Each structure stands twice: as C-alpha cells, then as structure tokens.
Design a protein around this ligand. Structure first.
Ligand SMILES: Nc1ccn([C@@H]2O[C@H](COP(=O)(O)OP(=O)(O)OP(=O)(O)O)[C@@H](O)[C@H]2O)c(=O)n1
Ligand SMILES: [Mg+2]
Ligand SMILES: [Mg+2]
Ligand SMILES: [Zn+2]
Length: 463
RNA sequence: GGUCUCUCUCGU
RNA sequence: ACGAGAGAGA
C-alpha cells in the first residue's frame, strides 16, 4: 500500500474530520500492584514522550507496492483456496437491507454505539437517527444512501490503546479508517451471506477462526492441524498488501460464484480515499482496516498468501496436505513435513510482506504445541484430561490490562473479565493473581470468580 | 474515536 | 429471548 496523493480538504471539497487528542486511559488502583511497561498510545503530535516526527511515523506503514497483477503462483493459490470454499455453498445472492442493518442469527447488526463516518460524523448525525432496533425500518437508510451514494471516503483516527513503549517512543500508533455507514451497509448486503458462513464455520475449511471461542476451539486445533506446525505474524499487515492480493481476492470471489457486479466492489477497497484532519489522501493497495468485513477479508487474503508462498518457495509442495486457520494476519498452520519459515519470509518480502514469528521475536524457531501461540494464547493440556486444551493468556498480558482503566465505574466488570482469562494458567498462578488484587482496598470489595467454579464451568462446555 | 469475533455483567 | 454495559483478541 502506498499513498498516491494528498490534497487539502479545500481543494477536494471534503468536510474536515476532527479527532480526539486526549487518552481516556487513566492509571487504575492496580497500577503499582503489578509490573508493566505499556502506556496509552501517542495521539497528539506534541506528546512529550515522542522521539520522532509524529505524522511521519503513523504513515510510515505504507511500505509501497510491488505486484499489481497476479503471477502464476498467486493464481494457483487463489483457485486452490476457492475450490476449498465451494464445499460450504456460499449463498452469493444480495442480502436484504433489513437483515444487513439489523442482523440475523449469524451476523450481528450494525453497531449503533459507534460513529456513522463521513459525512455524518461532520454533520452531527448519528447512527441511531437513521436505524431503530424496534421498528427495523430501512426507509430512513434507503433514503440517505440514495442521497450520498457509495464510495464514501474513510475517516482516519488514531486508536486510544495501551501500546509497547518502543511504539510510544517511535510514534507507531495504530490508524483506523472509519467506514461510512453507507459503504458498510452496502458491503453487508453484497457479502452478508459469506460473513454468515464464515462466522458459523471457524476452522480449516474457511481457513478462518473468526467466530471461534478459544475455550472450546483450542481442543480441536491439534486435530485440525496435524503434523508439524508453523506460524506467522505480519508486520504492518493491512498497509503491506499490494494491489495484487486484491486482484487475487477477485479470483476467489468469482470462482465461488459472485456476480460481476459484486466483485466490482473489490476495486473500491484496493483504491480508497481518506480524510485525516484537514487533508484528503488516496491510498492504492492496502486494506482499509475499519471497513465492513475487515477480519473476514484479511483472513481470506492470508489463505491466498500462505498457499502462494509455499508453492513458489518449495518444490513438491502439495497444497492439499496444508491445514491452516487465519484470524486476520495471525496464522497457525500445519504440514506433514517441517517448513522453513525463514524461506517463506524471503519470498514474502519479494511481494512486499514483512513476515515475523508469532511472538514477533527476531529469529524463527521450531513451533510445536508446547510453544505455539494463536490470538496471544498458548496451548496447555489439562492435567486430568489431557485431550482438553487450555487457552493460556500469559499473566504479563493480563497484568498490563489491569493497570489501566477508561472508567473506574467498571472496575469489577474489568477484573472479572480478566479472571476468566487468567485461571487457564492454573490454580497456583490464578490464586497469586487474586491475592494481588486483594492486596489493595478496592480489591477486597470486589466479587472474584472462584477457581473451582471456573474449572467446573469449563469442563461442562464439553457435554 | 472504525470493522468484527468471543466471553462476562445488569435489566421485562 | 430481548435491551443496557464491560473486557479481551484481530
Ligand atoms: N484493533 C485492530 C487491530 C487489528 N486489526 C486488523 O488486523 C491486522 C493485523 O493485526 P495486528 O498484527 O495486531 O497489527 P499489524 O497491522 O500487523 O501491526 P503490527 O506490526 O504491530 O503487528 C491489522 O493490519 C488490521 O487490519 C484491526 O482491524 N483492528
Ligand atoms: Mg501483524
Ligand atoms: Mg496479528
Ligand atoms: Zn484515488
């Protein structure tokens, strides 16, 4: 992904889009009970913690583009993946605006506690002014779309969140693209049934884990990924996608049976326009993370990428013995023989991809179930029932969340949520966690889940 | 101050 | 089941 041009809003006639500059993350009453090295991300250009030009760091993720048209390996990869999806029988028909706005049993409705994007953001109008859950009316929406049309520019914000201090110093905060409600509901109408199918079949057939529950999915992963494992993260995944991969995505969508009208929207994703403060800018390539179906499309492109790198990098690869699941750019995959991920990365850099170990560490090493991670969680077999697998969130990542808050009114909700992650690390680590919470006044006022009840509730999930 | 998924909590 | 809120993950 590379920025093509940057004109002021005056020259493009776009309305300015004003974004918050102050973090909502105050330190919590547990801020000094637990060690930790994450701080709220840099959001103002004058953040004293900066050591690099701010706006230059945010946009440094647009590495640039390499390929524009698919080669032989990427075509073969795309078709292999697409024939895999055929067995799901995606209904490619247009979804109706009622279900697209208000949801179905396998696709939650448009979030009305969040913005409506350009231009509504600047016009003061909110999503709840167009859609009501109770009537499930679409007339108010059908009207507005007719009036502003589609291909509406994305609104660029910086994300308020705890980040590494390396990334605070180097100004590498995350950019999100606020979709226009019009673009969002049109994508849902075009691809609603594919979203539905993906959410309802996490696993190695979608090659996706969107919709999975780690508490139960982890026990299946060793069965869905037999053989020797490998695993990746990508550095700057969304911006690092050259337009070739969107062409390759069109190949997949055609081959599962979408109309020439439907695949035409892919170019609207490969080629996007964004407002940030008082400027407009055009991005070619790169996924606009914040669009409808971000996770699902990131995951599908990843299935294409991995396949394409294997058959290009190694002779004698057989893509039918490959199992993988992707959640966005997180990969966990397996193959009957060991795969030298160092070579897949060399290939990726040729396509403009920066592949890294899952942990984002400096060297690749062998990956097996005892050191694997997916969605930050490890794999730890139960002591009594070794075929059940605990998703283990590391205690350090739990300690970092508990040290901050966006509203102390929710302290108990927060700690409870964290306890439900923590106890998979076992009774000793868990009770060390709970004793720490109890070592401060507010902690002794909180209801904390009892370990055995958590373990009993977990074991009941398999009945 | 986006798209999603998952889990929890509070309400007839 | 339906509404309200939270946390985590991508
Ligand atoms: N809050 C987030 C985080 C992730 N993503 C999507 O998931 C992708 C990968 O997630 P992640 O690895 O966390 O971010 P990266 O872009 O790869 O940056 P990094 O180098 O830090 O891994 C992103 O590119 C983005 O498209 C998202 O939409 N919203
Ligand atoms: Mg990444
Ligand atoms: Mg990732
Ligand atoms: Zn353009």
């Amino acid at each position: 992904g590379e920025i093509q041009w940057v004109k002021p809003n005056k020259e493009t006639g776009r309305l300015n889009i004003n974004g918050p500059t102050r973090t909502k993350l105050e330190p919590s009453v547990f801020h000094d009970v637990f060690e930790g090295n994450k701080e709220p991300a840099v959001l103002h250009s004058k953040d004293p913690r900066l050591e690099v030009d701010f706006e230059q760091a945010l946009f440094s993720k647009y590495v640039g583009n390499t390929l524009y048209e698919p080669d032989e390996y990427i075509k073969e990869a795309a078709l292999h993946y697409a024939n895999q999806l055929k067995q799901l029988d995606i209904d490619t028909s247009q979804m109706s605006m009622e279900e697209a706005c208000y949801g179905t049993e396998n696709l939650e409705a448009i979030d009305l506690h969040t913005s409506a994007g350009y231009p509504y953001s600047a016009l003061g109008i909110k999503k709840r002014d167009i859609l009501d859950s109770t009537t499930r009316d679409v007339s108010k929406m059908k009207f507005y779309m007719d009036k502003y049309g589609l291909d509406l520019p994305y609104s660029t914000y910086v994300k308020d969140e705890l980040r590494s201090i390396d990334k605070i110093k180097k100004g590498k905060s995350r950019l999100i693209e606020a979709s226009s409600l019009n673009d969002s509901v049109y994508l849902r109408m075009t691809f609603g049934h594919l979203y539905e199918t993906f959410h309802a079949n996490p696993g190695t057939v979608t090659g996706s884990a969107v919709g999975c529950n780690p508490d139960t999915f982890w026990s299946k992963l060793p069965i869905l990924l037999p053989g020797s494992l490998f695993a990746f993260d990508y550095s700057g995944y969304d911006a690092s996608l050259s337009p070739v991969w969107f062409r390759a995505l069109e190949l997949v969508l055609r081959e599962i049976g979408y109309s020439e009208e439907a695949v035409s929207l892919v170019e609207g994703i490969n080629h996007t326009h964004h407002v940030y403060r008082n400027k407009t800018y055009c991005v070619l390539g790169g996924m606009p993370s914040g669009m409808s179906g971000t996770s699902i499309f990131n995951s599908m492109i990843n299935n294409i990428i991995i396949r394409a790198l294997l058959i290009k990098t190694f002779k004698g690869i057989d893509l039918d013995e490959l199992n993988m699941v992707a959640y966005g750019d997180d990969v966990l995959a397996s193959y009957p023989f060991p795969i030298d991920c160092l070579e897949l990365a060399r290939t990726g850099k040729e396509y403009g991809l920066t592949m890294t170990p899952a942990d984002k560490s400096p060297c690749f090493n062998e990956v097996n179930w005892d050191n694997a991670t997916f969605l930050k969680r490890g794999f730890l077999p139960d002591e009594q029932f070794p075929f059940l697998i605990h998703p283990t969130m590391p205690m350090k990542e739990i300690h970092e969340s508990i040290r901050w808050t966006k509203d102390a009114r929710n302290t108990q909700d927060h700690v409870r949520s964290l306890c439900l992650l923590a106890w998979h690390n076992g009774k000793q680590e868990y009770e060390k966690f709970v004793s720490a919470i109890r070592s401060v006044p507010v902690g002794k006022a909180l209801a904390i889940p009892n370990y055995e009840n958590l373990r009993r509730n977990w074991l009941e999930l398999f009945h």
